[PDB]
Amino acid sequence: VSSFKANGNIEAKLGAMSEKVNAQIESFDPRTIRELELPEGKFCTQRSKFLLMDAMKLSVLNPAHEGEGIPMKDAKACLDTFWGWKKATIIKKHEKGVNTNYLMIWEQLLESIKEMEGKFLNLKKTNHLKWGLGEGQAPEKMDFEDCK
Amino acid sequence: MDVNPMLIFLKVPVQNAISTTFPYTGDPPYSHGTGTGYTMDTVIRTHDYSSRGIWKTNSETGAQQLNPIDGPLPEDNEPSGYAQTDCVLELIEGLDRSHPGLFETACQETIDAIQQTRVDKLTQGRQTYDWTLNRNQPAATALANTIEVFRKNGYKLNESGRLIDFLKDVLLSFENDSMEVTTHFGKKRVKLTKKNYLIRALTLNTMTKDAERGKLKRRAIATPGMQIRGFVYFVELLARNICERLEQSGLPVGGNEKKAKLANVIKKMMAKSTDEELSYTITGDNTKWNENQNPRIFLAMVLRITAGQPEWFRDLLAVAPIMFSNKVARLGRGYMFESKSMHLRTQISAENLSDINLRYFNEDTKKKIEKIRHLMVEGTASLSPGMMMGMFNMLSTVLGVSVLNLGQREILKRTYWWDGLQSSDDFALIINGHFKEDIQQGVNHFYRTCKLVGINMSQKKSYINKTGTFEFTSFFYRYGFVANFSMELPSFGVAGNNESADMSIGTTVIKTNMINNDLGPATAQMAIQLFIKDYRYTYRCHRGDTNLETRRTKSIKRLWTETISKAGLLVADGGPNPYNLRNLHIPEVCLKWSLMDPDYRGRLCNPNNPFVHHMEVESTNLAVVMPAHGPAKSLEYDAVATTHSWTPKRNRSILNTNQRGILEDERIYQKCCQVFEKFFPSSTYRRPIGMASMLDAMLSRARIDARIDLESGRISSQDFSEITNTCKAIEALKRQ
Amino acid sequence: IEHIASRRRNFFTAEVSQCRASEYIMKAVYINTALLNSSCTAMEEYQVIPIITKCRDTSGQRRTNLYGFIIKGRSHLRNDTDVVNFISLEFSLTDPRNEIHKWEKYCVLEIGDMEIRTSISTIMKPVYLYVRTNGTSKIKMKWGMEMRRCLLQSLQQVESMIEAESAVKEKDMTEPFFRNRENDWPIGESPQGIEKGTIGKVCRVLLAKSVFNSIYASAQLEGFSAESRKLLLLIQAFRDNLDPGTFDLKGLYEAIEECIINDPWVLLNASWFNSFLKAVQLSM
Amino acid sequence: GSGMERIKELMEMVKNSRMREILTTTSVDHMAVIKKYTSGRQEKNPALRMKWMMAMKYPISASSRIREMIPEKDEDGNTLWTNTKDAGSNRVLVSPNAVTWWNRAGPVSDVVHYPRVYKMYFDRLERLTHGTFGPVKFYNQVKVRKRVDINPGHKDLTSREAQEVIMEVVFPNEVGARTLSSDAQLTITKEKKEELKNCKISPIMVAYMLERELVRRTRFLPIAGATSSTYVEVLHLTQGTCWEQQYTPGGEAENDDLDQTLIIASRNIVRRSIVAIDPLASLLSMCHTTSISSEPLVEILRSNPTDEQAVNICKAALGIRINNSFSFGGYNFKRVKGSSQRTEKAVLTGNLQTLTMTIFEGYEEFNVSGKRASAVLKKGAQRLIQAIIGGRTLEDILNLMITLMVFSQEEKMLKAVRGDLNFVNRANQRLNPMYQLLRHFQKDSSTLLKNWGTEEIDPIMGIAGIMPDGTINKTQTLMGVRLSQYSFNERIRVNIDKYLRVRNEKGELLISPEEVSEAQGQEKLPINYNSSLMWEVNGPESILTNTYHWIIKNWELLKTQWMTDPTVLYNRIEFEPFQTLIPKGNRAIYSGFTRTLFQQMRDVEGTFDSIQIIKLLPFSAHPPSLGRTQFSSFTLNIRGAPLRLLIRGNSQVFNYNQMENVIIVLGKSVGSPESSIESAVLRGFLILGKANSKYGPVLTIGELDKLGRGEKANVLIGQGDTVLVMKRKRDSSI
RNA sequence: ACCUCUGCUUCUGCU
RNA sequence: AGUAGUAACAAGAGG
Numbered sequence A: 001v002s003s004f005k006a007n008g009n010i011e012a013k014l015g016a017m018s019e020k021v022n023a024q025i026e027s028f029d030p031r032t033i034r035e036l037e038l039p040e041g042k043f044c045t046q047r048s049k050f051l052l053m054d055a056m057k058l059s060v061l062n063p064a065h066e067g068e069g070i071p072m073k074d075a076k077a078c079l080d081t082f083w084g085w086k087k088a089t090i091i092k093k094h095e096k097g098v099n100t101n102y103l104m105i106w107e108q109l110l111e112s113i114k115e116m117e118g119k120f121l122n123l124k125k126t127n128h129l130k131w132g133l134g135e136g137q138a139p140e141k142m143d144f145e146d147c148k
Numbered sequence B: 001m002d003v004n005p006m007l008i009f010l011k012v013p014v015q016n017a018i019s020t021t022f023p024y025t026g027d028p029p030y031s032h033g034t035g036t037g038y039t040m041d042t043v044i045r046t047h048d049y050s051s052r053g054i055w056k057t058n059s060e061t062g063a064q065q066l067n068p069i070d071g072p073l074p075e076d077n078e079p080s081g082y083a084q085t086d087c088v089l090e091l092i093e094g095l096d097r098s099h100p101g102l103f104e105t106a107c108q109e110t111i112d113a114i115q116q117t118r119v120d121k122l123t124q125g126r127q128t129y130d131w132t133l134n135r136n137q138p139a140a141t142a143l144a145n146t147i148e149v150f151r152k153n154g155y156k157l158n159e160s161g162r163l164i165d166f167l168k169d170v171l172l173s174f175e176n177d178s179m180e181v182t183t184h185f186g187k188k189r190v191k192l193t194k195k196n197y198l199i200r201a202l203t204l205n206t207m208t209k210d211a212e213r214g215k216l217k218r219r220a221i222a223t224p225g226m227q228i229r230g231f232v233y234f235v236e237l238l239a240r241n242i243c244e245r246l247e248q249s250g251l252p253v254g255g256n257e258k259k260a261k262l263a264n265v266i267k268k269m270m271a272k273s274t275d276e277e278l279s280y281t282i283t284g285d286n287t288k289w290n291e292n293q294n295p296r297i298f299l300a301m302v303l304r305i306t307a308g309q310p311e312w313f314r315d316l317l318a319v320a321p322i323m324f325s326n327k328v329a330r331l332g333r334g335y336m337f338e339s340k341s342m343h344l345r346t347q348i349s350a351e352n353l354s355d356i357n358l359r360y361f362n363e364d365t366k367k368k369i370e371k372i373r374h375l376m377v378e379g380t381a382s383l384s385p386g387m388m389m390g391m392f393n394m395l396s397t398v399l400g401v402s403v404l405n406l407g408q409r410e411i412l413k414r415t416y417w418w419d420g421l422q423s424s425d426d427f428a429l430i431i432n433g434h435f436k437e438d439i440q441q442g443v444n445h446f447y448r449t450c451k452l453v454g455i456n457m458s459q460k461k462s463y464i465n466k467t468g469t470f471e472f473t474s475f476f477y478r479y480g481f482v483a484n485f486s487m488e489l490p491s492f493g494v495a496g497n498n499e500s501a502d503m504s505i506g507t508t509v510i511k512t513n514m515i516n517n518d519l520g521p522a523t524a525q526m527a528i529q530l531f532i533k534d535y536r537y538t539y540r541c542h543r544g545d546t547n548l549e550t551r552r553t554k555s556i557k558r559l560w561t562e563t564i565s566k567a568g569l570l571v572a573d574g575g576p577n578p579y580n581l582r583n584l585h586i587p588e589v590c591l592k593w594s595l596m597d598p599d600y601r602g603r604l605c606n607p608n609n610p611f612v613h614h615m616e617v618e619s620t621n622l623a624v625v626m627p628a629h630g631p632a633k634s635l636e637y638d639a640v641a642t643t644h645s646w647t648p649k650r651n652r653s654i655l656n657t658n659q660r661g662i663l664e665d666e667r668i669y670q671k672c673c674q675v676f677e678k679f680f681p682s683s684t685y686r687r688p689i690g691m692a693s694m695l696d697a698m699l700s701r702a703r704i705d706a707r708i709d710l711e712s713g714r715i716s717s718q719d720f721s722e723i724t725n726t727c728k729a730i731e732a733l734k735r736q
Numbered sequence C: 001i002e003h004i005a006s007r008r009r010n011f012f013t014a015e016v017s018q019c020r021a022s023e024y025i026m027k028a029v030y031i032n033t034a035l036l037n038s039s040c041t042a043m044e045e046y047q048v049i050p051i052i053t054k055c056r057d058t059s060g061q062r063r064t065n066l067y068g069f070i071i072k073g074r075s076h077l078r079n080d081t082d083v084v085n086f087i088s089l090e091f092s093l094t095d096p097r098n099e100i101h102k103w104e105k106y107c108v109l110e111i112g113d114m115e116i117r118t119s120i121s122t123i124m125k126p127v128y129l130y131v132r133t134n135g136t137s138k139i140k141m142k143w144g145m146e147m148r149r150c151l152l153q154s155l156q157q158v159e160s161m162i163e164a165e166s167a168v169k170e171k172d173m174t175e176p177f178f179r180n181r182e183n184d185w186p187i188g189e190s191p192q193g194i195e196k197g198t199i200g201k202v203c204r205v206l207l208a209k210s211v212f213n214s215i216y217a218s219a220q221l222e223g224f225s226a227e228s229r230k231l232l233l234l235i236q237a238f239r240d241n242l243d244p245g246t247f248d249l250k251g252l253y254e255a256i257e258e259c260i261i262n263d264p265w266v267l268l269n270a271s272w273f274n275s276f277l278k279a280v281q282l283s284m
Numbered sequence D: 001g002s003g004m005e006r007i008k009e010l011m012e013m014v015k016n017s018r019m020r021e022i023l024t025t026t027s028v029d030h031m032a033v034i035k036k037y038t039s040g041r042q043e044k045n046p047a048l049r050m051k052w053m054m055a056m057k058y059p060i061s062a063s064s065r066i067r068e069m070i071p072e073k074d075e076d077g078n079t080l081w082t083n084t085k086d087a088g089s090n091r092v093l094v095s096p097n098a099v100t101w102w103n104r105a106g107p108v109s110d111v112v113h114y115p116r117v118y119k120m121y122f123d124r125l126e127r128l129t130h131g132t133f134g135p136v137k138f139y140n141q142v143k144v145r146k147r148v149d150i151n152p153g154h155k156d157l158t159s160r161e162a163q164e165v166i167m168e169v170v171f172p173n174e175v176g177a178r179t180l181s182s183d184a185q186l187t188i189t190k191e192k193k194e195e196l197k198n199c200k201i202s203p204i205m206v207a208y209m210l211e212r213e214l215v216r217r218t219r220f221l222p223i224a225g226a227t228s229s230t231y232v233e234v235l236h237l238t239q240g241t242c243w244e245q246q247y248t249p250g251g252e253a254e255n256d257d258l259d260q261t262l263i264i265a266s267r268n269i270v271r272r273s274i275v276a277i278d279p280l281a282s283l284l285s286m287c288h289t290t291s292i293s294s295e296p297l298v299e300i301l302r303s304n305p306t307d308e309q310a311v312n313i314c315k316a317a318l319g320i321r322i323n324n325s326f327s328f329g330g331y332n333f334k335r336v337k338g339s340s341q342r343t344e345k346a347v348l349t350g351n352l353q354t355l356t357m358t359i360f361e362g363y364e365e366f367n368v369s370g371k372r373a374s375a376v377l378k379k380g381a382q383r384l385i386q387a388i389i390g391g392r393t394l395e396d397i398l399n400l401m402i403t404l405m406v407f408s409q410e411e412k413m414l415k416a417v418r419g420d421l422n423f424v425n426r427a428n429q430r431l432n433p434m435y436q437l438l439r440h441f442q443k444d445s446s447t448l449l450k451n452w453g454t455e456e457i458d459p460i461m462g463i464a465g466i467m468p469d470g471t472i473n474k475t476q477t478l479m480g481v482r483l484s485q486y487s488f489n490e491r492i493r494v495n496i497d498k499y500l501r502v503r504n505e506k507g508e509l510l511i512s513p514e515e516v517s518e519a520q521g522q523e524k525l526p527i528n529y530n531s532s533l534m535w536e537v538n539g540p541e542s543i544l545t546n547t548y549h550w551i552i553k554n555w556e557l558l559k560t561q562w563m564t565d566p567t568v569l570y571n572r573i574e575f576e577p578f579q580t581l582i583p584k585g586n587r588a589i590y591s592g593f594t595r596t597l598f599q600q601m602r603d604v605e606g607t608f609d610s611i612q613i614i615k616l617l618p619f620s621a622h623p624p625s626l627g628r629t630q631f632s633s634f635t636l637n638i639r640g641a642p643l644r645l646l647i648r649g650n651s652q653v654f655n656y657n658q659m660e661n662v663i664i665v666l667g668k669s670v671g672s673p674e675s676s677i678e679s680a681v682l683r684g685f686l687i688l689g690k691a692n693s694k695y696g697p698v699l700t701i702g703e704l705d706k707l708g709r710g711e712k713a714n715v716l717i718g719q720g721d722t723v724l725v726m727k728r729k730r731d732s733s734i
Numbered sequence E: 001a002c003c004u005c006u007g008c009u010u011c012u013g014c015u
Numbered sequence F: 001a002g003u004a005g006u007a008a009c010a011a012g013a014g015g
């Protein structure tokens, strides 16, 4: 390296490298290019964390009730604006779910609200609610030696 | 009508609305679980690109080492590591000839640096592979561990405090028959074999890169240990010193300075061109830059750059490339397995991959393991080729620039020529010539020359157009740089340092963006409003007259009801927002100073408060931020230290581990350092120098402080005697 | 300049505050904030979180809105990607059975009836509850908490277009842009062709884009956006008469295309790119 | 008990074997490492982590002593602290309610030192409170990236001088061996030492703030106007993409900044005036209308002692007495007799570096005075013929010698540069050759001194000598260097003619405008010319954009005038600034070319092209001169770098963008106006369309003369294109 | 059962 | 189940 002196080194190896090693330019004309191809499969489905356009609100105007600012109080006040309840039925199944459990979570929820007292509401860990929240679904963790 | 935002581009040039193509209002991608798959991927690909080279078994580690240098020339456009020593040398010689005296100067500066650098320079890294534990640790902790284990095994030249002496210890440590370390079962002494130790010394730990934008799929990064880091540091310093004097280098200049340099290069180029020449620019990127760089080539570069220099320095700088030629990669955390039938899950280690049954793995991973098996050595993978991500950014830059440097008319004497700018693997190449055929030939000459030195232009990532517009590392040029405000969107929020630091950072971000990224005044005003709301919610410091309920409401309400001049309350104390465009550069405490009840002000700014955790001048009013793109940056901010300058609690997970003992060691160390500073306050500003023990210095200082205090009358004669007495008792107690 | 900025800001604050995208922002900020704090403080509790926003009519009155409820699962969230499971339960008048592919993960219940009267008589409408298991993480909750930054992405671009015209005209074009209410930017497509909108519309469209980027953040979106940007840039170079060339256009198309996998937002963005390309082709 | 509590603590620690082991076996040096020993990691996502922790009851870590200093529970029953130790320390976990408690009800200290310690911060607010706002204007302006100062009120110290000073001020007894040479250092120390006595703010913050204050800091920023630090500080407020908010910060200017701005203003005025029909009248007009930060330029010129060629031309015009000198290296240089002339040439340094450099060639004599030293100098072309030098100290005589050796421009100093010295910054920006050399040889002259030589001195004793040592020596000296000891400061009445030539009462030529530096600098302070002769928007880039924007916006009127009355168009006053961007030697030919081409467009009907007209129009504005030169471009000097504007089609400087339908000048839109035959590219020829090998080989441009009326060719016209031209059968007179 | 600890800490690199 | 997406979470560790 210390005595190195260049003398056509690059030129020589450029002359020994196949023409297949190149960066040929292709003229780019957006008039002759194709549209992107989209994947195929089942139709895409909603994955927001909350409803968007299909949402419906229960509203109270100029709220004044005791606890204005406390979420669950505001929530009770909003609920109170709806008279037209009826026995919940399932009308569109979660095909991979235990649809029964969802019905029961709602019924549990509504009841627990109507009965609630205080500012926060924590629900009982029923079997239907556990299921819906993946309670115990983590596999039990073991040493490899013991399950190999 | 269906709304389509992309249709704006029918009227507005893409660069002028580029901001909209950056979706940086959402969470960036993260890996979950192991990176071992990504590590195997890079190991495999790196060998694949060099596969037609020569295999050898390393005499010291037993590692299988692939050498593609001076290998067969590329035969197609696939990424190649077949770099040719003589071609690299020609390029570096070309760089020497274009810049007489540059190598000599950069060497001279590097030598001075080697003489002056303190061992503690290595504390400046982030997470570092710690061979004494076979786990990552903070850089300073990793340094201390190496120093301690070295001295217990008889290496202590580093006691000099000089980095170069620590470097000597490192090389000398490889002669040891069996390096002793201690593991925690209580405490057990473990003896590494000479081979074990060397393998750990040559290790880069690996993990996956999180929070990287713009990519579907993840990749692996690496962290070297302390044996490597001191040597790499000096190679990269030398390379930096060179890059600073190359008109074609994009490093280490940052944002505005980088843009100024690029604009100058275009201006230069155009002045040097004739009016009859065409000019095209490649917006350029390279395929798998790091995997196709080669330590053997870096060794050549270092020897050639340092030609004529003292042999000790040449050999010292050659260490980093040699170590990289002999490196191994830890394979990461392994994999997890699951049994549907038995609802269970388990962790296997990377080390298990040497000999685990292959039935557990998907086909892809089984193939990876099969390929990697012949490389595995005491739990690691041999990786002679490649450099791994970002290890020699500057030296690799020197290689790319050397190709740019070739494009001078008086060297080529062709119907074309080129110049440009390069930063790592990113480049803008400007090619000039009389006809389009000249441009094509020039582009082919540049591309093929790059191939001869293991630089592989990414065909699918690069494009070409007539000079006037181009992109360079997310800077868009349309006859001059335009703004890209969206790059910065993630920095608009609450930084999470503390209440004082965050107010200052938040207002500064707005201001900086008004100056640099065309953040208009109305949006800047709205940015102030949005920041203040987020700060108030984050820190639960809603204005004192509001009726939100938090754990802080009652105490802030009292402060409010009791305050006379409410306009003087800091926002974090439930006060109003004072900020508008005109005062963004004024620290809140200054801005409100004249409006503060004197008692609040005297409390807020009480220097005796227990909240502010001062440490070091050099790290005062410094935050770390992670930009959307690129490395972590230190951020200076302007703020008065108050009770709002507090420190959040530390992680406690280590309490549940065998490493909990470390917490105790830290506490002891800190206690010793704190008391030291009660005797040497200047040590918080600059680092104190000396071979004297901490205790001896404190004793000498107490005595002579007590004597001056006596004469000057700050202290009684009784007090004074007790001080000298306490000193004598300490003197004595120090003899068991 | 502060006075100038506030006048333009009032234009902006209007357009954006009344935009439906801003409703989603507030839902997202409220939900993620509540879920993060609950996740941290109540790790063992199945805690209930009402989905609330508060707004004012243009007619000036405050209103509190309830959309439904979230039930939080346990939440020993350690790594930043660690998941909290939760149930969402959300009111709607939309019958899902008309578009079931939109609702694969949901169990929709019928829970009541809602009145509508007029004159000759009235009509009762069923009230549905859209129920589903879902999940999120500390990283996703943090970003959701910050969704107000979407306002800046839109308004900065809008303000840059106002400023660009203002420089050439040598005066503040804010009022002309907001009031001359002439259709001066292509922002959509009808069956007849390309439709133009005012700067107000551009603001809301760019805001919606930004908000959707945040709701539907993905690696697919990241890769799609970065790779498709190169193709946008190549088109622009052609339209600027700068004689652009590629080295492996096929490989560039494959790099874009592999990022379009299953995400509805990325699928639509890909479709938009195609529409843009066709419209540009037609104009040449 | 000053010292009492800390020694007792130390006693207790040494009673523990572990702590004693550490304190006896850790060098002061090694403390630097163990100080950072930790299991704690630098948070990698602090934003997320804070949002998480702020939900928790006890997220804050506070000193153990909090437990003694505040209640455990507050009035509302909030727990404020707990006894849980934070991992890795003796700090304890506390509530944010503890911070509020402290701020409402904790101990009240006095804050007298706060303003002084945080002066750098408070000064910001002072400047703003006393600032004045003018109007906002809307326009496009190029904001060019340069390095600018960012901290008003620094004391221009290096980091090592600052450290030294701060060590003396804050930690005097830990200073070590060496102490402060500089007197600047010493008076700062005393001032600061006096300001900060009895100060109880943490010394960490005091050192931090002193370091921020005392050291000059810079940054690269896009900046259109005043570059002074007090203006940089409010760049977000005064500059936008399309606007300027006129503003004056409260407080005094620096004398340095004013002097610097005065020179820039005066040069700008001189350069603008030289291109007017009556330079002196135009210069006086501008002098009388111009202000620097609302101060009339006339008053500054009367009261300001700056000696500079353009400044002095302005002083002469105004009847102000001048000291016929300039500044260099802090020394003032009066030319007694002789003269020389500016010529650039290539120059290899001993650094090993090529460099264009303006070098003065000719015989000259200089009286030189500084505040501590003085000399007589005789000069040739890079010739130090002789330097007779005096002053207070040896030191001060030395420092002037260095300066004069460098000022000579001698080869021996050229080829005595050693180590790192470059003539372009990191950003590729050309730097001042002579100031670079001066700063170098003031760092270290040892090579220079040894490379110079010596000389044997006579017995006319009194003509003393100085040795390559720096030593006082009787028989030997350096080469041309001697030592010895009314009216050097004295200001003279001069006269000035219509073309700005300045002469004494005796009528000898003292200053000519061609001796004024061509460097386009950026003013530290705002200049308002308030003049019909100057664009309202300052700067060279702005001359370009303003001129083209103005043509376009007035295009309807200007077009009719191009058709009906060209000569009145060409002579319009709005084109004069633009003339200053054209090299002096090219103005006439560029004009002749342009007028000819424009006449051709008229003669050859159907070949009107408004863009071509707009583009070339400003080049019409000089008495024409016909020639044989075809131009493929015109050169413009912008910031001392030539840009070339292509005659045919678009260039980096000037291009029409079809897609936007705008003209773009230096990257800025300046708005829009809204057959194959090209009449206004070549003098005498027409372009018909694309090349045709029918009519033979492709000729250069500079090979077209050898054709004849009606005869054609193929031409490499520029930017890679080949075209079919025809020599015209009749040509146009203009 | 139940008890205890942990919520970035066996995994976040480089100029 | 659900989140997600090239490998994880769906509590871990210890008693």
Ligand SMILES: CN1CN([C@@H]2O[C@H](COP(=O)(O)OP(=O)(O)OP(=O)(O)O)[C@@H](O)[C@H]2O)c2nc(N)[nH]c(=O)c21
Binding pocket: D309, D326, D327, D328, D335, D340, D360, D364, D379, D407, D408, D409, D432, D434, D435, D517, D518, D519, D521
């Ligand atoms: C070696 N020099 C330098 N010099 C004068 O030195 C003065 C300042 O030095 P300079 O390096 O030219 O700076 P200047 O061009 O003013 O700086 P700027 O870059 O701001 O334009 C000029 O006015 C110039 O005339 C000289 N003047 C004469 N007559 N003869 C000389 O030999 C020399």
Ligand SMILES: Nc1nc2c(ncn2[C@@H]2O[C@H](COP(=O)(O)OP(=O)(O)OP(=O)(O)O)[C@@H](O)[C@H]2O)c(=O)[nH]1
Binding pocket: B213, B214, B285, B390, B393, B424, B425, B426, B461, B472, B473, B474, B629, B630, B631, C226, E014
């Ligand atoms: N050493 C180092 N280089 C980095 C880092 N981040 C980015 N780079 C380099 O800087 C380049 C510019 O990054 P960007 O253009 O902002 O992003 P990108 O997604 O890689 O680039 P595009 O292809 O333009 O979308 C990268 O392509 C790398 O070459 C980093 O953390 N360390």
Ligand SMILES: Nc1ccn([C@@H]2O[C@H](COP(=O)(O)OP(=O)(O)OP(=O)(O)O)[C@@H](O)[C@H]2O)c(=O)n1
Binding pocket: B209, B285, B286, B287, B288, B289, B290, B291, B388, B389, B390, B391, B424, B425, B458, B461, E014
């Ligand atoms: N976070 C990052 C990103 C990039 N790099 C460095 O920058 C180089 C170029 O980055 P990039 O172009 O993104 O990747 P390549 O390795 O070139 O691979 P490819 O372009 O084929 O994806 C990398 O090889 C590596 O040396 C790094 O160190 N850290």
Ligand SMILES: [Mg+2]
Binding pocket: B285, B286, B287, B288, B289, B425, B458
């Ligand atoms: Mg790359």
Ligand SMILES: [Mg+2]
Binding pocket: B285, B286, B425, B426
């Ligand atoms: Mg890259």
